[PDB]
Design a protein around this ligand. Sequence first.
Ligand SMILES: Nc1ncnc2c1ncn2[C@@H]1O[C@H](C[C@@H](N)CC[C@H](N)C(=O)O)[C@@H](O)[C@H]1O
Length: 236
Amino acid sequence: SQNFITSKHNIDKIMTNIRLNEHDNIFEIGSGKGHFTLELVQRCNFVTAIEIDHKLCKTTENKLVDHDNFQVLNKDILQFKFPKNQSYKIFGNIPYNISTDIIRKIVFDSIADEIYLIVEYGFAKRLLNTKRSLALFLMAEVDISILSMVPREYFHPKPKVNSSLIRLNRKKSRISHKDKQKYNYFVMKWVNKEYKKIFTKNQFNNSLKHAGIDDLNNISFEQFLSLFNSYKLFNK
Ligand SMILES: Nc1ncnc2c1ncn2[C@@H]1O[C@H](C[C@@H](N)CC[C@H](N)C(=O)O)[C@@H](O)[C@H]1O
């Protein structure tokens, strides 16, 4: 059930959009046959490949024979403990079934200042959709941008849908550690339209007009923050 991108011609097309340089240390999520890995090692300063499947760790190693700036840890990305005092970036052509868990792991339990992932086209659209809780929790920590479309033919087994190469850039968190829970509760209550649990009937009108929200079915992350902030004001 794991797919791969093994056409160099295609890999180069995708590297074209990935701006990683010679001095960055990179953590790749799932080396697979080592195709993207082979390019990263040449492209970057050092690559720590994290592959769960042990046979693939081997293949990754055979692939990277004429190279030294890498290591292949046979671990589970979800259980990995990233450095807490180093500057590193992340890349990964990750599986659909655990996209949410991986992205959450690397954005909340890692300090990579720049993350490059390939995910399903739809799932990418969702990461930017202010109507879903994931996008909202994520936008407090990173800026999300879709760089290009990865045709399903580039993959094998050929999936039923296309994919997108996306980029997550770290930013000074917009949500203080103090507001950790308030923001969480508020995000969940708002996405579920359970407005009354977070705003009285008037607090809600003022908050929307204050944030300048005309279409309540289409709001910017910046507007949403306004809402959250008003929310804080109203409750001590
Ligand atoms: N939980 C996990 N932790 C670490 N690696 C995983 C996990 N789940 C899947 N993988 C690996 O991640 C890879 C997913 C592939 N789509 C990418 C392989 C390869 N980089 C390629 O795109 O050509 C496979 O090699 C899986 O074995």
